[PDB]
Amino acid sequence: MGFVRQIQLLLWKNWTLRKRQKIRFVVELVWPLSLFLVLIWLRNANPLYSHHECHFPNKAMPSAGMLPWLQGIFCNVNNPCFQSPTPGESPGIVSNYNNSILARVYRDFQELLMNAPESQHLGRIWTELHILSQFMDTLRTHPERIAGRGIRIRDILKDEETLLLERFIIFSQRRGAKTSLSQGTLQWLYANVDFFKLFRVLPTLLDSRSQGINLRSWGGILSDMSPRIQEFIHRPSMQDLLWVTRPLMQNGGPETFTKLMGILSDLLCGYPEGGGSRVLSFNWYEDNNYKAFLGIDSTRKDPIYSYDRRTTSFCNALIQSLESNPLTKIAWRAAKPLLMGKILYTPDSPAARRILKNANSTFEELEHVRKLVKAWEEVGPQIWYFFDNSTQMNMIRDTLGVKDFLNRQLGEEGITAEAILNFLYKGPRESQADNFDWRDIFNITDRTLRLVNQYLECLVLDKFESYNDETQLTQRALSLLEENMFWAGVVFPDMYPWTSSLPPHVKYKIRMDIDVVEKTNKIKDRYWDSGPRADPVEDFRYIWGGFAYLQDMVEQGITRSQVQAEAPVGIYLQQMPYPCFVDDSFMIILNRCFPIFMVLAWIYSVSMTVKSIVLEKELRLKETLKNQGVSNAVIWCTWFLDSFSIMSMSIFLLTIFIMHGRILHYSDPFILFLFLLAFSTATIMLCFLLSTFFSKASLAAACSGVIYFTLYLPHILCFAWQDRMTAELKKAVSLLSPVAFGFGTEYLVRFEEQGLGLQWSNIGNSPTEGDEFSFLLSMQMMLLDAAVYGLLAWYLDQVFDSFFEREHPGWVPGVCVKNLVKIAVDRLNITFYENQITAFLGHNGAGKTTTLSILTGLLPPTSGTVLVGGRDIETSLDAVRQSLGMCPQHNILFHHLTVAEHMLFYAQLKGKSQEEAQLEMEAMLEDTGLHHKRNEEAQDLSGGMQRKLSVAIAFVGDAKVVILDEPTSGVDPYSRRSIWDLLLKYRSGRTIIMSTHHMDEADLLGDRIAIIAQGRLYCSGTPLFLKNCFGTGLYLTLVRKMKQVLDGDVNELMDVVLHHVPEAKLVECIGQELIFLLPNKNFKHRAYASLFRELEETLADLGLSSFGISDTPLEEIFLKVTEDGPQLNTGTQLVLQHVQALLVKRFQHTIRSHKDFLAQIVLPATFVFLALMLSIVIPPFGEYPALTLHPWIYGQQYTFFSMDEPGSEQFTVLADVLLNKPGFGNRCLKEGWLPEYPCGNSTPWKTPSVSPNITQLFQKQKWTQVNPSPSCRCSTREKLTMLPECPEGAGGLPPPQRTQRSTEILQDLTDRNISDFLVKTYPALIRSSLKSKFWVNEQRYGGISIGGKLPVVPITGEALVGFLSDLGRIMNVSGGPITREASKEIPDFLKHLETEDNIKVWFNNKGWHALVSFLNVAHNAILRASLPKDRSPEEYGITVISQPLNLTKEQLSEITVLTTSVDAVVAICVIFSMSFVPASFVLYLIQERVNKSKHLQFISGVSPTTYWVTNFLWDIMNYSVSAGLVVGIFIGFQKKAYTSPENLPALVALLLLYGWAVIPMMYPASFLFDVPSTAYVALSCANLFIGINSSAITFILELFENNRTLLRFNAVLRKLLIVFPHFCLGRGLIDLALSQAVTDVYARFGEEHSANPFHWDLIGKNLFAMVVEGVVYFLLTLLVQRHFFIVDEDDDVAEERQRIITGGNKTDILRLHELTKIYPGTSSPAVDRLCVGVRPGECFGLLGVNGAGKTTTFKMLTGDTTVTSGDATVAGKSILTNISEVHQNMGYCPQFDAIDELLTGREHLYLYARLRGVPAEEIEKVANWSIKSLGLTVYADCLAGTYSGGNKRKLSTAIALIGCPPLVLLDEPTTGMDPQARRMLWNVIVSIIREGRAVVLTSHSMEECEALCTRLAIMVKGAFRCMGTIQHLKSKFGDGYIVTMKIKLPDLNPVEQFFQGNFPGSVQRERHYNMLQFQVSSSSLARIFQLLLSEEYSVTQTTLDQVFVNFAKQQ
Ligand SMILES: *[C@@H]1O[C@H](CO)[C@@H](O)[C@H](O)[C@H]1NC(C)=O
């Protein structure tokens, strides 16, 4: 035998079959690639974002002064990222602003001019210049000497002597004023007293009032200070200042608002490397925008514009020109509520007033500036006056500057001084001379300072308004907020309007709207992003929204109201640094789309494999191969390798595209191949399992892809609960292989993120930190699911005188049976011989099927043995199957396999090599007469030659024994002979056994016969022996002609046979016939011989046409051995009878069917229920929670601290109330604070332990201060990692730790670099905190750093007004009323600009509320660090709450969109669920359109209108029940908008009209589908493609308020899609929810809205469109159905001329003139002209040559198809105009069975009785009679459809015979009836004809058509070739008189010679041993010339089927 040869063979056939398909083959290799191209377009549409490190500057809170606060607002607007650590994140520094040119200028100034060891002596000059021009230069009132007065006084006095003088005066002074040394002394009675003082030209002795003199103590320093000043101007700092300020003054310089900001930035900020980078965000889905990516613009409407009361005419023009200008319009929107907003402080009481008094320092300090600027309006004119008309300016430097000694002093002056210009630019008034450098420096300062003055008064700086309850606050809040003038509103909940003293725990709320606050639902991003979260606009709403500034101000006030410390500390916020990173947005969609695409790419290749496996099992092609000797395992193992080699060829291309398409960049392309392979191997063994469920191929092909897809959906639910999925639930759910695929895909993507592939090294491990489910478990569980599926499918497949005769010794008995019994076969003993055909009879299986089974070898015997060549089968079960051939009743052929391939396959399977197999095939193709069309497909053969091939296969190889049962069943009489030729040819050397039931076939061929009576041989022998063993006489037939009234005179007919009358005579006389019956017995050759002889010449005299003399039928010899006009309803009553017959017909079918009760009821309810249940997992959003802000709302976490600046006081207690008992924050109060977060117990400081490798690394190696512990590898060029690699080189050693009794873990970072420790240990934290990528917590959120100081301004307060007042007094100003108050606050104004001793807090922006949670901790420790030393600071605290401000009807205009978008999906679920019932109603119509049941209804007369009307009527009422169940489920869920006393009518009407309008829509789909399953799965997809893409597009398309073409599309689709009801139901179920939302936001605040449905605005036009299209479609289905609905032979002449020219019907029933049926056109009509006529009492035959075209005659006669101008009439009317009047006078028995397989036998009769007549009380008796006539009473109540094989045919012949029609059409009314059953039908069909009712018959056999027909007509390609009776036609178109005789040691020499009398014939036909067949002539002379023989004899007439072969022979 073989085991590896069968496999080669089966592989060959399967490979050859999977080549003639060529459209499954192409799809199975192209569809996956067309599915993975989109996944490459998505790779290229989602690029990659990387960035370097980020170090961020810090932000000062108001408590850190005002100058740092405002400078930090302006400098850090964009929050820059700096790549290199900022100067403010150092241990002792906080400032962060060197390198501003305005600080370097100051440093240079203070360095070289000030602190001048050289001079430092301008103090002397100032003291002298002030002591003179304050005391002496005035002299206005004080008294003096002779030479003393205010302005001009002389000295001359005290002279008693009377008075060259001009010469003396000129010598005294040289052009000198009152404001020389010796010349007059040597020229000298005047030198006695008149020279009282020698005070000569020496310049310093005049002011000797009290004490003082100094002359050249001015120039010695005035020439000192020059070169240093010049050098200072030559420093680079002043160079840069002057350079930068060159624009910004020249001509429209500041216009670009990037030059201006650039100048200001380089001047005030100092930031390096360009400024910074501005990291971005890219999320939009944590914020629910849905219009950030969609392109819509998202702005609130700009607020109301109203002129205000008491602001200004400038502060109303600006607010408008700056707001309605669509270029700024947004910055202003954000900045306005801060600088003109307003703050509201509900609990108006003394204590809150004190808090808000102390919380007000910032605005006070900020109006101290407006006063100082208003003072210029007063001091301006005074400076003007002093510099224009003064006694000290133009009277000391313009009226002077001596000018002669002054000129001499100027001669030694500097280079560029210009005393002339120093006089022109020092008092020129009435000049208008011009530069001018004098007044263009003063009018400019006015123009630029009064402008600032009139800008600064727009700011509102009094903004605390009180109230008394929260409701009034909220009312004023929305009133202001619609104007854009609202800051927060503060609420002190636990105090009363009479409270006076503060409790030692104060809490408050900040209530702001939601656009400037973080949402209080979420506290994290749901999906982790790998980015710093440092975007200035979306990620910092607690800063530009002003929440943090107000929080700081109020906490400072609360502290200051109960501590009285008078030593402040400010707060700086610092953001923690972040490492390098890459952000890939593909890895989000890869992780979700890879498994979907992979599962969806095999969805077709799975179904087309279950299809093949089940189909070849449905054609019984598997039990054939199992009988032939093939084990089941080989079958499966070949199926596996068939399916495997196409998966394995598509995988090879998937790998290439995935790798080289850059979907995966670096991942070892061999492991991915070997990973997809396991999925394919599990999939195939799933197909093996799925096949063992189904029994019909078409159903499996549809239900299998659906199961494959459904099995994957658990991964959706396992992609949410990633948290509570342990290791075991991964090891257990992963038995479903498609989820084990996704569980490995996630590790694939997680590895690809890290910069690593899989690389054969990490697949066994996991990056998920000890989750013990590696990547290998996925592979190793798919390769286990395969084994489980295979080994479950295998088992589940398994579970499902004498009578015998003398036998010549010259015969070799090949097969011999020796008493085999089984329990059936009682003492059976027969021998089948060598070359001989044996016809093995027996009724059905009483001894035939059982015995043939053993002879074949299937089953063993019970008692006896069998020999095949002398060797029992039970002993040689295998090698005996070498000779046994066999063929079963059905065909054994493979579709798509050519004929020669069949011969080769079945030759080689028996055991042969290709050589001999090919040789034998070539011999067989020549012996079989199929050498032509040898390479044709096994289908598409004629159908008789399919049987010819199926019986030629049983002979293949060397078959010594052939068993074949009914080889010729069901082929036309011309193909039976073609088959018989084969058997008569291969008969030569092998035995053949031939079970059959055709009785003539057992005789025309067959050499022995055996009859199995009741389990035993009851006869045997040759046919002649059997005829003689029973021996009844001859059958003389006599046929009379006509001249109607033909003939019929038995008087002269019986008289002729009365002379030799034997025994029984006339046995029949049917119309124009005269059958007889006579014995043979006692030879009497002369007697008989003389009869025929004499009759021959005396024939034409009597009137007969001819005569025959047949023997005894073989069927009659086997038959006796086995076990032997009511009136009709019509009219409206008839129609009211039809409409009640059909309803009962459908009702009785639905009760008994349960596969209806599924798709009619169960599925709708379950699917809508699931939709609803997954619709309410979302609650009806309230307003917003409170969310007390404290740092434990995050999980376990690490905090830190850092005592910078130690030893100092107030910091060693601030560092202790923060670590020790009171702890961080506020959780541990002695009393309360949220008894949900408990307090525990602390542990001592404990440094962790370190690997020795590290400790060796640090002390041995030499590090630095700028380069501590080693760096981290960043993304290079092709190894882009998500986060850097970071070796065992973190910040350094682990620092001390602890566990605060809060349960946090703080670590002490004192004396260490923090921005090195934090950037390098972050990845090692979030690698252990990742592993899910949802709701990660990061374990580190903040820490404090106590210390930092910025150097404050050095000059004190009063020391500045002391100087300013003196400067004023020296120049006559004296200020006024405003100035004397602007100088009041100047000593307190300078202590509030900076703080000098202040802390900083570090925050991690990846947790949303973590800024204001640690700001509170800081402000909470500052309180406890300063309260008096006997109050136990464990009790004090402050807590902040948030609570946003109620939404405003436009905020909700988007929560509505986000809320109704789930109801827009429940609507699609409802449509998809309800579109199952109408698709179930259509499968029934398809089932009746095929199998011709509908046509059968129509023939009886059901007038298609009433058929369709009754179907629609039943379908509506059947659908109403499911609709009512859906209404019940909505009422149960009690939802609003659908089940409310005004939404029930809308919902119910909307549900009912849907079915009403959609049922008639899908009726036309019943005319173009012929397989129910394909129709179901092609309607369930249209009712989805039209359900989604019509209900959703309008919804999505309404959210575009612009483009003016999107609305153009929307408003016209909403009118163009109203043609079909899926739209009319989607736009109804969505609108009934939108209206509810809109009428439910109103009821939130007062507004009333009571809109109703049924109003044509929402659901009126829908309910109209449904009613109209529920009728137009129905009329369409009433029309799509209305479109559907020479010479001749010498015996055809009589029928030609009977009714054409004579006209002779006058009583006939089927006048049927020349009818012709021409197709559109091929050559000629299939039916040509034909004339026939049927009399009342005879059965027409109408045989017809097969294929020539006969069925078309019945099609025309039954109205099935259309005639081409014929003429056919029935008894009273015609066939062309009154067809409904001729379809009640005829039955019709279809060739194929047309019965509903769910009712029963009896109610088919009930139905068809009702469909025609039979009033109500007679149906009972009519149906009773019909059941017993045909013999059905045993089975008459057992669901036709279980009826075996002939009860169906009996039923069809019963219902065709109901009532009493005068015409009956029978089409092959006996097909699978055993030979006893046929008689019980033929008797009936003769009983009718005896009554005068005609019958037209048709059959493939020539037996029945000979048994009960009275005339025939053979049809050939034309019309006719004969008419007349049987006997009349045998002779007129045949020959015959076969003669047989046994030669009584026999020899056959003398017989041939003695046939000397009979030469014209004698073809001899046979001779085995002594039997002699012969065809003599037809003169019946043999009967007289046989009485001198030489034993037995016989002379029969040729059979009727010999005539048919003769007619069909020529064609
Ligand atoms: C501005 O200053 C100039 C001095 O250059 C003076 O003449 C003039 O009156 C001032 N006012 C105006 C409006 O120019």
Ligand SMILES: *[C@@H]1O[C@H](CO)[C@@H](O)[C@H](O)[C@H]1NC(C)=O
């Ligand atoms: C801290 O409290 C007590 C101290 O008496 C200690 O025994 C206990 O184990 C610690 N933890 C808790 C939760 O009490």
